[PDB]
Amino acid sequence: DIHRLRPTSDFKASFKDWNDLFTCDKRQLRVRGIPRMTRDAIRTAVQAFQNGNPPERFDTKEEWLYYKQFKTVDYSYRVIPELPEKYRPHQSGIDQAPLPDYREINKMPQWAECEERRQSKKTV
Amino acid sequence: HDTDRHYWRAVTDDPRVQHLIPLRIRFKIFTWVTSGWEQRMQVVQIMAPKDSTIAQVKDLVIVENQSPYLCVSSFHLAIDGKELDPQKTLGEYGITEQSQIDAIEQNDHLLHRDDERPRDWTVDEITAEDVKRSPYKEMEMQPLQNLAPRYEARPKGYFGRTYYSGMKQS
């Protein structure tokens, strides 16, 4: 079970045992009620396991779900961001750049005042 | 690729025919032996045209030595110690193939040459950029290693099963 459109693990009840899985050809997979891409994946996995290649491949579901959320046309693992109609702060109603209050941010913090009080206590 | 020749001529005409003399010119060199330096002779052979002057023979010796130890300074051509006038023709001195020509150098100077003329310059103006050899030294026909053999990959009229006509008129 690697592909989203090949739900291989959803057909565990469609087989009796290991021998029933490894003796069914594609016509018997069509008889059992399996869609075309899923039965093709099952048959190719069985034929790869018979040739000496176990099904050890990376599950590409979450990577494709990450790449799906962009507007690429060919699903080619690119990143194409969406451009909205207003991409600047001046057209969002904000008149000018925000001025920071330089008198409020240059005040001494509370731990500094407590340490100044402790210094005045311990100096005298 | 404009080489001023747009047809096939299998023969060579008169403007490329030159009358040449194989003039060999000697140089005084010094070789190291177990005792010390010994004076020997190094010969440079050129093909000079018959109606050329001695300054042109000196230029031909300069462009055809291919050795960094021979034309190191300004030299002068001489015969039997008597120096040669560089503005005189070879026929005015009776210079033949058997005439012994020496090149006396002055090693305190430094020969500053500027090779703007190619080594193989004929009248038809076809020069190689990577030639690196006198045209009298190189062979006439050799194997071409720079090109690549290519076969016909585009069939004209015949493409398949039965050759009826082959579309030979096309």
């Binding site: - | 403007p15 109606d51 002057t53 300054a55 042109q56 503005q87 500027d114 703007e116 009248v123 103006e125």
Partner: protein, 413 residues
């Protein structure tokens, strides 16, 4: 209809800013005529335009340039006493009057020459203008103020342009300079005033322009212009020596590739200048260059500069002969716009190996041509290289004139 028509419609001509506006509008008119895109414009005699003008569809291709030149003439007849008044504080400086005269002369040299039967005016208006009074007015306003000519390169181009205006329009060049440096002399020529007051050029092209103006300003006076020596080899006049030494300056002809932007026509000017300097001062050269040591520090500098200029000129001749249309025989414009560098600078290179507009930028620079020797160039250079040698030398054994003659025969066959 030009904008200058709205400034001469009855205004107060004694105002300074009106004269400045007239001058700027006439400069704009002449520059629009000179820099006109004449790509599709054609002037062929068409029979159907006999009793009318050109067609309405063919106005911009046939009628526009002729009407522009006729408007330039009819405005020059009304304006030339406002910008350049008669010689008796001024309304216009000498530099802007010089710029107006230069654009007027550039419009006059490229006038419409072909006279159609459609034209109702005289054919004599299809001839270039005679600007003899205006060059004298500009010279009178230029000798009035000091430091009109400077050692800058823009002032070098202004010096070349003023000497050109004096050569073309029959005006003496010594009027551009004050009379105290011309005092003590009965008569001086244009080329002598050029060679006496030339600045040191920073490029080879400015020296080529100066060496061309020296030859063209003195046609039959080319003997008296550049003769600085006696018949025995002694230097007569050191002013011509100091002028000719600073013409072939080290900032112009010092590099090995100093003639990299010299075409086949400018190399003829260089070799003609070298041959004229050798021919007029032959007793000096054949005495001093062979086996003579001199104590004058100026003569050794002049001889070294002449040897360097002649050697790089012969090397450029061998470059254009033995390597025709080569990439090392290509020329370019001085301070030429190579747009690939300015496109790489004003872009963001995250990878500097990826050069933007590479297929167009590597092909395109300000004017860059493959240079080969033509017939008129090779037949002139075969004479000039033979002129560079002495009379006792054999021209048969010269290995460069023979190569030029064989190149001419091979390219003609």
């Amino acid at each position: 209809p030009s904008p200058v028509d709205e400034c001469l419609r009855g205004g107060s001509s004694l105002d300074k800013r009106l004269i400045q506006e007239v001058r700027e509008r006439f400069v704009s008119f002449c520059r629009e005529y000179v820099l006109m895109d004449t790509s599709g414009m054609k002037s062929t005699i068409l029979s159907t335009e006999l009793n009318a003008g050109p067609d309405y569809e063919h106005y911009d291709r046939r009628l526009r340039r002729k009407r522009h030149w006729l408007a330039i003439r009819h405005r020059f007849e009304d304006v030339r006493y406002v910008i350049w008044p008669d010689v008796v504080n001024p309304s216009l400086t000498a530099g802007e009057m010089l710029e107006a005269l230069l654009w007027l002369d550039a419009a006059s040299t490229f006038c419409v020459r072909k006279v159609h039967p459609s034209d109702l005016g005289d054919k004599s208006e299809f001839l270039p203008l005679d600007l003899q009074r205006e060059v004298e007015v500009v010279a009178c306003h230029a000798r009035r103020d000091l430091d009109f000519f400077d050692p800058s390169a823009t002032s070098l181009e202004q010096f070349t342009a003023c000497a050109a205006l004096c050569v073309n329009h029959r005006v003496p060049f010594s009027l551009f300079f004050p009379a105290q440096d011309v005092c003590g002399d009965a008569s001086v020529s244009t080329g002598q005033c050029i060679v006496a007051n030339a600045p040191s050029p920073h490029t080879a092209l400015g020296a080529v322009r100066i060496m061309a103006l020296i030859s063209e300003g003195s046609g039959s006076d080319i003997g008296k212009t550049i003769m600085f020596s006696d018949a025995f080899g002694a230097v007569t006049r050191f002013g011509i020596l100091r002028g000719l030494s600073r013409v072939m300056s080290v900032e112009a002809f010092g590099c090995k590739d100093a003639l990299e932007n010299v075409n086949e026509s400018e190399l003829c000017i260089i070799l003609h200048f070298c041959a004229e300097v050798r021919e007029q001062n032959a007793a000096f050269f054949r005495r001093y260059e062979a086996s003579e040591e001199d104590s004058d520090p100026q003569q050794v500098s002049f001889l070294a500069k002449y040897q360097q200029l002649s050697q790089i000129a012969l090397a450029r001749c061998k470059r254009l002969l033995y390597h025709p249309d080569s990439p090392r025989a290509q020329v370019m414009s001085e301070d030429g716009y190579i747009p690939l560098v300015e496109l790489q600078r004003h872009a963001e290179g995250t990878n500097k190996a990826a050069l933007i507009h590479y297929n167009l930028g590597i092909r395109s620079a300000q004017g860059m041509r493959r240079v080969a020797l033509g017939a008129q160039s090779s037949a002139r250079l075969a004479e000039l290289v033979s002129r560079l040698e002495e009379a006792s030398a054999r021209v048969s054994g010269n290995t460069l004139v023979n190569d030029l003659v064989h190149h001419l025969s091979h390219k003609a066959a």
